[model samples]
Target: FEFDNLAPMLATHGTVAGLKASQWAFEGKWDGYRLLVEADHGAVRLRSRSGRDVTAEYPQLRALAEDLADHHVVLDGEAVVLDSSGVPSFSQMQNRGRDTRVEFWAFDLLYLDGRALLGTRYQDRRKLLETLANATSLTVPELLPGDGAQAFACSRKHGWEGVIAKRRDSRYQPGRRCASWVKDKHWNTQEVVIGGWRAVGSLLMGIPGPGGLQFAGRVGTGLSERELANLKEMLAPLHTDESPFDVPLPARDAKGITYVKPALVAEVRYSEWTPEGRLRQSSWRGLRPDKKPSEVVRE
Candidate 1:
């Protein structure tokens, strides 16, 4: 029988500050796909943060579920593809496509033995997750020692994205960005809504700034061939010859832009914001369906 869909509890987006290390737990914040995996009666399935059934893509994930007869459970985690240095690489994962060597780093357990653990405390839920980790022989995300600041230092030393802080007493709240959990990153990475693009060159990115969708800058780096072609196909349907940004652009940006409806969201890394109010040294990361387009703004 097919497993039923269970909406996974979502974490509230936050940075590490004002958190008491003694009252919360810290975990490495991997930059990858948010996947919710479920196993029941030997049948296992996986879904994205937006609830899309995308299990057929991960053979490794399927193999981990081969003996799930009594290990029925729902898990929340990041499916990260590690690079040569053993660090999670979002761009590399996208580049690999179906050949990606992905691993689901589970961090929370919400159900088991035909019962829901939604009401369980975050600490208890983690303990339950550890137990399920052994039963399924899956990798659980490593929890860090010390407070939020120290955890951030650990991530910095290892060149990770950052650390996630979950309130010890926090409960699993599906579909809500509850204040119980937060994230802190070491670098300047921001989200942008892909509102326009050039058929051959760059993507016209924007953010929900103080004004409306203000032009950030052009980003044309870090996309794999398939990623580029796939995005081109996606934007073709939403294409427009007109500009989409509320503000004017530089002569370089207006060279040959094809606008699209503000629909898809993306992430990027940059050195800094220019005084001219544009992103300096920006490189595209990948698309983020987990986050909404409207939520893409300068941070």
Candidate 2:
């Protein structure tokens, strides 16, 4: 079914500190449920990523839907599980989502009165959202204005995930990661799957192709060369295939690439996601053979 109330989404990057310095508005990236809110003809529904109606799962949010000033409005926001300190707990949110008991904490408004407000400026939409929302069981996301750098520093001080930066005049684009919404994470560790590699010619002399799996990306920023070399040796046995990507690798346009059965996992450091949803500027760290390929799904 085609849903019209869903807003366009854009991704951006900026350190919390940097974001604060830029005087851009800031809101805690609540680590919880992502809901698409739609209300029409006195009916409201909250849909999850898989497009399942979950309004019954959160009665508090259903009450909030009933309290909206406009019966035909839609919003995009996260359902967060807040701690006593009023800060969101990622682990708690995960658990709540698993149990279907999380609260819908509305953050960004995407549509109003059946009109697509995604292309409208964020600030304009925010104003309209604040006016229409009637504070039911749902709480509006607090908007903080400051420079990105300062915001980032505060997030670090408070042990937050990081910060996101956006242009005040930027338009929302759905299903695409744009530079307008920049995310600056505080932690260093990230997830990556072993796709495939280029042949480091020097390492392979007798092996038909190049020796040593060149690696799709060498997450070395957080690893030492010795560690990288050790991982290389460990992956040698699985070197039967030249490429490990199942669908397609963008950079080289390598589609239907051969794989070693998804037996490897690696930690990585990345700047951000490309528009196409692939990791951009990622470097390798180490291997986690304990992780299976079936669990290697992409984010």
Question: Which candidate has the top score in lDDT?
Answer: 1
lDDT of 2: 0.57
Alpha carbon lDDT of each predicted model? 0.77, 0.57
Please provide, for model 2 over 1-299, each residue's C-alpha lDDT reduced to its tens digit, 9 standing for 90 to 100. 23643433645644445343343556656577677877664577778855677877766665666666445777777777877676677787756644445566666667677677777987777777777655333467555446665666666666567666666677767666777677677554544556443332111101011322223333345455576566556656675544444333444434333344344666665655444444455655556667654454343
Candidate 1 lDDT by residue in tens digits, 132-178:
67766778867887777788888777778888888989888876777
lDDT measured at residue 49 in model 2 versus the true structure, 0 to 100:
59
Clashes of each: 0, 34
* Reference-based TM-score, model 2: 0.57
Task: Score candidate 1 by TM-score against the native.
Answer: 0.62
- Native-structure RMSD, model 2: 9.6
User: In model 1, where do residues sit more than 4 Å from their true spots?
Assistant: 1-5, 189-298
Model 2 misplaced stretches (Cα beyond 4 Å): 1-23, 97-101, 133-138, 157-159, 190-299
- Tell how far residue 8 is off in model 1, in angstroms: 3.7
Distance (Å) between predicted and true CA of 122, model 1?
Answer: 0.8
